[PDB]
Amino acid sequence: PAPPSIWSRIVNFGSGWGFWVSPSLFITSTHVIPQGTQEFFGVPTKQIQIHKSGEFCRLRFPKPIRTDVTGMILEEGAPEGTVATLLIKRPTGELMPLAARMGTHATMKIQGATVGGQMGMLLTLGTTPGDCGCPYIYKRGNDYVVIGVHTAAARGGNTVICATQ
Ligand SMILES: CCOC(=O)CC[C@H](C[C@@H]1CCNC1=O)NC(=O)[C@@H](CC(=O)[C@@H](NC(=O)c1cc(C)on1)C(C)C)Cc1ccc(F)cc1
């Protein structure tokens, strides 16, 4: 499960979703970002500072946009064995948190491409196309930590991939 504040940060972004780590820090997947728009949330792309590390896409805006959200902790993956939660929203509005025991951090070969991220293993419906960009989060003490965004889900198994950095 997750609090309603963490869920509010997830917003539709092109083919998938994106997560407001802070009023001005927006993370998403490289596969889902729209490649034809010169504006994001009314802010010109010329003012936005984008840094991409594989399928992890980082958007820094000049001004704060979502002043309602507190700034969370963003880190490169979670300790091996950490049971994280994949907060995937669906178009219908249904909320579908999935429990995923994170695993090895590594550079992977996904469909002939190279992706830095962390493997995960879903526990006990599943992920689908249009889910990339949704965040992985786990609770550390009393603080919430986001570790990456969804990127792929190997077929013939419950292996999921959490792009990082
Ligand atoms: C093209 C449409 O694009 C989208 O809509 C993005 C959403 C889907 C969501 C998947 C979709 C289903 N369940 C899910 O969670 N993502 C992808 O399709 C990715 C490919 C896979 O998931 C493949 N996985 C692996 O190759 C793979 C290999 C290992 C190892 O782990 N995963 C296939 C499962 C489709 C796209 C991709 C390609 C090359 C990369 F560098 C990085 C990413």
UniProtKB/TrEMBL annotation:
Mind telling me how this protein is modified after translation? Specific enzymatic cleavages in vivo yield mature proteins. 3CLpro is first autocatalytically cleaved, then processes the whole polyprotein.
Where, if anywhere, are coiled coils annotated? none
Q: Which residues form the active site?
A: 31, 55, 132
Q: What sequence ranges are listed for the domain Peptidase C37? A: 2-165
Q: What does this protein do?
A: 3C-like protease processes the polyprotein: 3CLpro-RdRp is first released by autocleavage, then all other proteins are cleaved. May cleave polyadenylate-binding protein thereby inhibiting cellular translation.
What is the protein name stated in its UniProt record? Genome polyprotein
Organism of origin is Norovirus Hu/Texas/TCH04-577/2004/US
